[model samples]
Target chain A: PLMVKVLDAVRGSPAINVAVHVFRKLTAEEEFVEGIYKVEIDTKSYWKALGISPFHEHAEVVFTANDSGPRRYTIAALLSPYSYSTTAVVTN
Target chain B: PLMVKVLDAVRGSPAINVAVHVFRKLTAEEEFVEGIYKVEIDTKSYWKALGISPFHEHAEVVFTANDSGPRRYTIAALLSPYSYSTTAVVTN
Candidate 1:
């Protein structure tokens, strides 16, 4: 299991940091504008891709907007396993 | 659009803070065990519910975890409009 962590943003927002784990690497078609990545997956599909259910865990592909604040953006809807192994570490 | 900003966690990780906007308030079925709020919406649903579409925008219902570090949690898969307006403010 790959552990994804979000570091603190000194200027922008911590929401800019997204964590996602998938069996396959990302493709070009899903790439939105600059710095925005759109990904959608489900538990069964992940099981199909990974060749193992991983406890029927779900994962989401997330994207962080620009590092600057006062920005406008949308978050793509993604699927994650209901039960999986991963930790998102955030600092106060 | 409501501006949801994430405050700095001097002790824990910033991933604990989540931002989400929707036409209706959340339901109790989605309430997980703790601070994690699971929400899902789509472009048309938000438009139908909001009565305006907000440019056919989509919004996600997010939940922040406990304000501590070295944690384990799951992000529920929810739907957001293809487009919406919201600013997640994150401080360094």
Candidate 2:
């Protein structure tokens, strides 16, 4: 299964309860195939709930996968009002 | 106008000489503009020279910019063979 974590840079802590908008939603029962994926987070909603209209619609990461067959990916994203960062760890 | 720094996760050190293939190459004389940009890192080339055909063509970040007028952006990227992380600090 794939794991994703998000951080709110304004507070430098886990962005708990934030919604993740993955292009191809990976469910707990699904298997990951070697391919391309575009992951988007519902950043606008987050900022709006907190009372500011952020400039972007979402925070996204587009990447291609597969090396030693089907591997695991850990995603870490850092987000704020007008900017964000998305990073990942691929299994060897 | 913008700053970028990279780290090689394999060695836990800076990724020196790694080429940055930003979709819109920023210039020394270029002024920071508030718009959407896709900044990509030349991961394939980096891994190729070090001796392996990497899976992905590049590592990319797409974002829209500007807040309280033109502010400084410092990008921090962490990279390895099948994975990479891109983070940034937006000045207040």
Candidate 3:
């Protein structure tokens, strides 16, 4: 059984260091809208091992306002493997 | 001249290495919404040197849905020194 599928994928799975907080919102055409407030985190098995798919669970952020004095943002979501979860909006 | 006011506050300020990406969303009582994407990342002068001011600039995230199985989030934004910018909603 391939050693029980590698011991059921590293059994006991103890590698937890979870504490994520990101928030920001501003729009007067200077657009920036980020929101979050502790909402029962499971984060879909670490975004399904980073392949993303489990219905894509909605998370998309992309911000950039540069005069070369430091201003940037790039966050993406929806990498579906299946179950119709696609909201592709990647633009400059 | 007090060292020219600390050399005009770090004159020529060149220590730029930035890249931040965070995105996620899911709600139906399973609540979780995180969003960010390349937005001229100055991050408000590195969040106003970490004292959080400069109108706060909006950024808030906090997620936690623990079942002893990895799931968490915590992001906050809004710390005005003046000029009214307060939307304080920090609850469990």
Candidate 4:
């Protein structure tokens, strides 16, 4: 009953394939600063799955995570205007 | 050249690959609320690239994005102790 995903960099740019993976599971206060949070999402496998090598640039991203619900989340980065979203079933 | 990484949850697991992607590039204002920030990470390509279908749980994540340097960042989630990271050349 998993439903997590990470999309593509090139939305409409010549079949920019992508993959999604749920690497690490995180909580509040630990990785987050009382109100901040971070999730471990591996794009390496996602890229390899799409027949592409993990290649690109990197940078310090200004971002925030919001608790929309117990089973969903949205991480919006200010630098790239790109957002990472996912849903989970809180079993605890 | 760029450098950013997001690890996994199931530590010491075999064949448990993941992917990372950069989507919707954003700025450090409207999205971060002066201090708050969010980033868009597309696991879709990473997953697809790894030949694995995106399937997992969807839950609200508590995360924080730290500015390590000019073109480096680290996003850590509290719950699963997970993180997503990446880098980019700020040309603007």
Model 2 DockQ reads 0.04
Ranking according to lDDT, highest score first: 4, 1, 2, 3
Poorest lDDT segment (10 consecutive residues) of candidate 2 chain B: B42-51
lDDT of 3 by residue, A1-91 (tens): 0111111222221221122333332112222334422222212221112211322334443433323223233322212111122323233
Better of 1 and 2 by TM-score: 1
Question: What local lDDT score does residue A83 receive in model 4, on the 0 to 100 scale?
Answer: 21
Error of 4 at A32 (Å): 28
Model 1 misplaced stretches (Cα beyond 4 Å): A1-37, A41-92, B1-5, B17-92
DockQ, all candidates in order: 0.04, 0.04, 0.03, 0.06
- In angstroms, the error of model 3 at B5 is 65
* Per-residue lDDT value at A47 in model 3: 18
Worst 10 residues of 4 chain A by lDDT: A26-35
Q: Model 4, B1-92: lDDT tens per residue?
A: 23333332223212212334332221112222111222335332312323222222232323343222223233323232112333232222
How many steric clashes between backbone atoms does each model show? 22, 0, 51, 94
Backbone clash total for model 1 is 22
Candidate 1 yields a Cα-based lDDT of 0.27
Tens-place lDDT digits, model 4, residues A1-92: 33343331222212111233232331112222211223334222311222222222232333353223222233223222122323232222
Which portions of model 4 show Cα errors greater than 4 Å? A1-42, A46-92, B1-70, B74-77, B80-92
TM-score list, all predictions: 0.16, 0.13, 0.13, 0.13
- Cα lDDT computed for each candidate against the true fold: 0.27, 0.26, 0.25, 0.27
Alpha-carbon RMSD to native, per candidate: 23.9, 25.1, 27.4, 26.2
